[PDB]
From a paper:
Vγ9Vδ2 T cells—a major subtype of human circulating γδ T cells—respond to multiple cancers and infectious diseases in an MHC-independent manner; they are specifically activated by small, non-peptidic diphosphate metabolites called pAgs. The sensing of pAgs in target cells requires a surface protein, BTN3A112–17, that has both intracellular and extracellular domains. Here we show how—in both humans and alpaca—multiple pAgs function as ‘molecular glues’ to promote heteromeric association between the intracellular domains of BTN3A1 and the structurally similar butyrophilin BTN2A1. The BTN3A1–pAg complex functions as a composite interface that directly binds to BTN2A1, bridged by the pAg molecule at the centre of the interface.
After introducing two gain-of-function mutations to the [name].2 domain of [name] (a BTN2A1 paralogue with 88.7% similarity), we observed efficient binding to BTN3A1 [name].2 in the presence of HMBPP. Notably, Vγ9Vδ2 T cell activation occurred only when the JM domain, transmembrane domain and ectodomain of [name] were replaced with their BTN2A1 counterparts.
Numbering used by the authors:
A (entry chain B), B (entry chain A): 321 to 516
The structure:
C-alpha cells in the first residue's frame, strides 16, 4: 500500500559506458584503465561515464544506499528509464535526470554549479529516496540518516531507474545490497553468527 | 511479497512497563527514576522493562533500525503478539522472544550466556530484520550493514511485533523513523536543502 521498499539494486552492464568495469556481482563499478571491447548498443551511455540500475520503479516508495568513500567525482540519483544516452547529455531534470554529485570537492544538486550543498562533512554512504506518486527524489547521509536534498517535484510519467556516474579513477562505487537475513543459507542449532 | 519493507515503528504506550518513559512522538524511550501511574491493562509488561511496536506482522519481510548509543543494558528483536506480559518471563524463543541484548558489556543472542557474540566494536545502530514465512529474525550492525546473528528458524505461528527491553537508566533507545523524503513539506522551485 504505502510501505517504504528497501530496494535491492544490481547494475546493468548493457547500459555501462565502456570505461566502467562492473564487479562480478554487478553491485559495484570502478572506472578502469581503458575502453572495454563492448558493443555500442542503444542503451549504453557512449560519452558520459554512466550506468543504470537494472530495477525499474513504476509506483510507490523505494530507497537504496550507495558507498562513495574515496571517490572524488560521482553522481547518484534516479532517471526516466528512456533518457537519452548518446553524446554530451545534460544530466538535469529537464532531460529526466534527478541527481546529487561530487565535483571540485563540493556537493551539487541537479548536476549544477549554481546549487552547492554546504554539507559540514564528507558523505560515505548516500541514501537515494523515490516517492513515485509524489514526484519526489530525495537524498540522505546514511551516517545519521539526515536529509541532504529533495529535487523539485516532477511528474515521472514512465518507469524510473537508479542512475550512477563515476567521474574519478580513484575508488569503486558500491551499491549496498538490501538486507536478506539468512535467506538461502543453513541456520545451525546455535544460530548463524557473523555471516560474510 | 519478495520486496523488503522498511517498517515505520512507533512504540505502543499500553505495552510499556511503568518505568519506561516514551517521547511525545513514541519513537524513543528511556528507563526513568520512578514507576509512572499508568492504567493496569493486560497488554502492559509489569515486571520486565519492555515495550512493543504498535504494528504487528503476519507475512513478508520487514526491517527497522534502533539506536542504542551509550545504553549499557538493552534487548531488541521480535516477539509473538501473545507473549506473557505478567511476571518474570524468560526472554527466550520457547516463550516467543527472538532477541539480541547487551548484558555485562557482552552481546548475547536469545538472552543466553551460551550465545555470546564476539563483536570487535560497540554497536550504535542495530538493524532488526524479519522474514515471517522463512522464520527468520536477523540482526545487523548498520554502521557497515554487516550481519550479526540469525536466530534458529522458528514457526512464528501468530503475528509478531517489534520488541524492546531497556534495563539501564542512562540513555534513551531511538527507533529510526522510515525515510519520508519531502512528504508533508513544501519543496521550493530551488528544491529542499538540509531539512531538519
Amino acid at each position: 500500500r504505502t510501505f517504504l521498499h528497501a530496494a535491492d539494486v544490481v547494475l546493468d552492464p548493457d547500459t555501462a559506458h565502456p570505461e566502467l568495469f562492473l564487479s562480478e556481482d554487478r553491485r559495484s563499478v570502478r572506472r578502469g584503465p581503458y575502453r572495454q571491447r563492448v558493443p555500442d548498443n542503444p542503451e549504453r551511455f557512449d560519452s558520459q561515464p554512466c550506468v543504470l540500475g537494472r530495477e525499474s520503479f513504476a509506483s510507490g516508495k523505494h530507497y537504496w544506499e550507495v558507498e562513495v568513500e574515496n571517490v572524488m567525482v560521482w553522481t547518484v540519483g534516479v532517471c526516466r528509464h528512456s533518457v537519452e544516452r548518446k553524446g554530451e547529455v545534460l544530466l538535469i531534470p529537464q532531460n529526466g535526470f534527478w541527481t546529487l554529485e561530487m565535483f571540485g570537492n563540493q556537493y551539487r544538486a541537479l548536476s549544477s554549479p549554481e546549487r552547492i550543498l554546504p554539507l559540514k562533512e564528507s558523505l560515505c554512504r548516500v541514501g537515494v529516496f523515490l516517492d513515485y506518486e509524489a514526484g519526489d527524489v530525495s537524498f540522505y547521509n546514511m551516517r545519521d540518516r539526515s536529509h541532504i536534498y529533495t529535487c523539485p517535484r516532477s511528474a515521472f510519467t514512465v518507469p524510473v531507474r537508479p542512475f550512477f556516474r563515476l567521474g574519478s579513477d580513484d575508488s569503486p562505487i558500491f551499491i549496498c545490497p538490501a538486507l536478506t537475513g539468512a535467506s538461502g543459507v543453513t541456520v545451525p542449532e546455535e544460530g548463524l553468527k557473523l555471516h560474510r
